[PDB]
Each structure stands twice: as C-alpha cells, then as structure tokens.
Short mmCIF file of C-alpha atoms in Angstrom, two decimals:
data_model
loop_
_atom_site.label_atom_id
_atom_site.label_comp_id
_atom_site.label_asym_id
_atom_site.label_seq_id
_atom_site.Cartn_x
_atom_site.Cartn_y
_atom_site.Cartn_z
CA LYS C 16 -13.36 34.25 -16.06
CA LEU C 17 -13.41 30.33 -15.20
CA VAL C 18 -11.70 28.85 -12.52
CA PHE C 19 -10.85 24.98 -12.05
CA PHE C 20 -9.26 24.14 -8.59
CA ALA C 21 -8.58 20.41 -7.17
CA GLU C 22 -6.39 19.66 -4.30
CA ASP C 23 -5.42 16.45 -2.18
CA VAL C 24 -7.12 13.33 -4.27
CA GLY C 25 -6.28 9.65 -3.25
CA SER C 26 -3.14 11.18 -1.25
CA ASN C 27 -2.10 9.41 1.89
CA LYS C 28 -0.81 11.97 4.96
CA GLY C 29 -1.74 9.11 7.75
CA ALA C 30 -0.37 5.65 7.96
CA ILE C 31 -1.38 2.51 6.10
CA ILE C 32 -0.07 -0.83 7.41
CA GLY C 33 -0.67 -4.25 6.42
CA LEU C 34 -0.28 -5.45 9.88
CA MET C 35 1.53 -5.21 13.34
CA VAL C 36 2.81 -7.52 15.48
CA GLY C 37 4.99 -6.85 18.78
CA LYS R 16 -9.36 33.97 -18.79
CA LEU R 17 -8.99 30.36 -18.09
CA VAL R 18 -7.03 28.65 -14.94
CA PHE R 19 -6.88 25.01 -14.21
CA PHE R 20 -5.33 23.82 -10.81
CA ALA R 21 -4.49 20.54 -9.87
CA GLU R 22 -1.88 19.65 -6.94
CA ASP R 23 -1.44 16.90 -4.65
CA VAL R 24 -2.88 13.63 -6.84
CA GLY R 25 -1.72 9.95 -5.69
CA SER R 26 0.76 11.64 -3.71
CA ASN R 27 2.31 9.70 -0.40
CA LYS R 28 3.42 12.14 2.45
CA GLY R 29 2.89 9.74 4.93
CA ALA R 30 4.02 6.19 5.91
CA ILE R 31 2.98 2.76 4.13
CA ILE R 32 4.40 -0.60 5.39
CA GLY R 33 3.59 -3.80 4.20
CA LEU R 34 4.26 -5.61 7.58
CA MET R 35 6.17 -4.66 11.06
CA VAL R 36 7.51 -7.13 13.45
CA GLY R 37 9.13 -6.24 16.63
CA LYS N 16 -5.25 34.06 -21.42
CA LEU N 17 -4.72 30.61 -20.66
CA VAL N 18 -3.01 28.92 -17.58
CA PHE N 19 -1.82 25.53 -16.69
CA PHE N 20 -1.04 24.23 -13.24
CA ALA N 21 0.07 20.80 -12.15
CA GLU N 22 1.86 19.94 -9.07
CA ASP N 23 3.22 16.75 -7.08
CA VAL N 24 1.57 14.11 -8.80
CA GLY N 25 2.42 10.34 -8.20
CA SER N 26 5.45 12.12 -6.20
CA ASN N 27 6.78 10.39 -2.68
CA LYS N 28 7.51 12.58 0.33
CA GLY N 29 7.00 10.09 2.88
CA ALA N 30 8.50 6.57 3.84
CA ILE N 31 7.77 3.20 1.84
CA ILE N 32 8.68 0.18 3.02
CA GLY N 33 8.54 -3.23 2.21
CA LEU N 34 8.64 -4.82 5.35
CA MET N 35 10.40 -3.97 8.97
CA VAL N 36 11.84 -6.62 11.32
CA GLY N 37 13.79 -5.66 14.39
CA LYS X 16 15.60 -21.48 8.21
CA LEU X 17 14.97 -18.19 7.52
CA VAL X 18 13.11 -16.60 4.33
CA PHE X 19 12.99 -12.74 3.44
CA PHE X 20 11.01 -11.82 0.17
CA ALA X 21 9.93 -8.21 -0.89
CA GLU X 22 8.58 -7.25 -4.57
CA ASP X 23 7.10 -4.33 -6.16
CA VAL X 24 7.59 -1.54 -4.09
CA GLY X 25 7.30 2.19 -5.18
CA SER X 26 7.53 0.74 -8.48
CA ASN X 27 4.91 2.10 -11.63
CA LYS X 28 3.74 -0.24 -14.23
CA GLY X 29 0.86 1.87 -15.64
CA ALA X 30 0.93 5.53 -16.41
CA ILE X 31 1.66 8.83 -14.66
CA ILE X 32 1.11 12.17 -16.67
CA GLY X 33 0.97 15.78 -15.37
CA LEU X 34 -1.71 17.00 -17.84
CA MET X 35 -2.49 16.42 -21.05
CA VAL X 36 -4.49 18.83 -23.64
CA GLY X 37 -6.22 17.36 -26.62
CA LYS Y 16 10.75 -21.80 10.19
CA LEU Y 17 10.14 -18.35 9.14
CA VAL Y 18 8.78 -16.62 6.36
CA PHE Y 19 8.30 -13.25 5.53
CA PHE Y 20 6.77 -11.96 2.10
CA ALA Y 21 5.57 -8.58 0.90
CA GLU Y 22 4.30 -7.62 -2.61
CA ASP Y 23 2.63 -4.56 -4.14
CA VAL Y 24 3.37 -1.78 -1.51
CA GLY Y 25 2.91 1.70 -2.68
CA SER Y 26 2.62 0.52 -6.77
CA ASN Y 27 0.76 1.87 -9.38
CA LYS Y 28 -0.75 -0.34 -12.03
CA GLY Y 29 -4.06 1.78 -13.09
CA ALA Y 30 -3.05 5.78 -14.66
CA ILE Y 31 -2.64 8.61 -12.19
CA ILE Y 32 -3.49 12.08 -14.08
CA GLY Y 33 -3.49 15.48 -12.70
CA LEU Y 34 -5.83 17.01 -15.56
CA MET Y 35 -6.99 16.38 -18.86
CA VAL Y 36 -8.96 18.88 -21.29
CA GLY Y 37 -10.49 17.59 -24.51
CA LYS A 16 6.28 -22.46 11.95
CA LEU A 17 5.60 -18.63 11.31
CA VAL A 18 4.17 -17.33 8.14
CA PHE A 19 3.75 -13.71 7.63
CA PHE A 20 1.98 -12.11 4.52
CA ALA A 21 0.84 -8.98 2.98
CA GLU A 22 -0.21 -7.70 -0.59
CA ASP A 23 -1.75 -4.61 -1.98
CA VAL A 24 -1.02 -1.95 0.24
CA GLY A 25 -1.36 1.68 -0.44
CA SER A 26 -1.51 0.41 -4.13
CA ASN A 27 -3.70 1.67 -7.07
CA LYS A 28 -4.78 -0.25 -9.67
CA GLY A 29 -7.78 1.95 -11.21
CA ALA A 30 -7.62 5.10 -12.03
CA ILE A 31 -7.07 8.46 -10.34
CA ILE A 32 -7.42 11.85 -11.92
CA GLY A 33 -7.52 15.41 -10.26
CA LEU A 34 -10.02 16.58 -12.85
CA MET A 35 -11.23 16.19 -16.22
CA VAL A 36 -13.11 18.63 -18.93
CA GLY A 37 -14.93 18.06 -21.98
#
C-alpha cells in the first residue's frame, strides 16, 4: 500500500500588494 | 493499492492587487 | 487498484485587480 | 493629463495541467 | 501629469502541474 | 508630475508542481 499526498503548494491565501498609497 | 492526491496548487484564494491609491 | 486525484489547479477563488483608484 | 494602463492580468501564457501519466 | 501603469499581475508564464508519473 | 509603476506581482515564471514520481 502506497500513498502520496500533497496540498497547498505555491498558493496564496493572504494578500499581495505591489504598493499602497493613502 | 496506489493512491495519488494533489490539491490547491498555484491557486489564489486571497487578494492580489498591482497597486492601490486612495 | 489505482486512483489519481487532482483538484483546484491554477484556479482563482479570490480577487485579482490590476489597480484601484478612489 | 491622465493615463491609465493595465496589461496581462490573470492571463495564462504558459501551460496548466491537472495531471499526466507516461 | 498623472500616469498609472501595472503589468503581469496574477499571470502564469511558466508551467503549473498538479502531479506527474513516469 | 506623478508616476505609479508596478510589475511582476503574484506571477509565476518558473515551475510549480504538487508531486512527481519516476
């Protein structure tokens, strides 16, 4: 019996912003 | 018995913004 | 018995915006 | 003068694949 | 004068794959 | 004069893979 599991690889759940200006 | 599992690869669930200006 | 499973690959569930201006 | 430009947003130029077997 | 420019946001130019087997 | 520039945000130019087997 052989099992391979991979999850959440190179995923974005947060926030990525180049820049922010008020 | 062989099992292969992959989930959530290079997916975006968050927020990606180039720039934000008020 | 052989099983292959792949889900949620290069999918967008969040929000992608080039730019935002008030 | 006001200029707004955006390009290549949420676009795929490469290759996306769920799985492959030889 | 006002200039806004954004490029290559959330874009894939490489290769994304869930899994592969020889 | 005002200039806003952003590039290559949340973009993939390399290779992302969940798993691979020989």
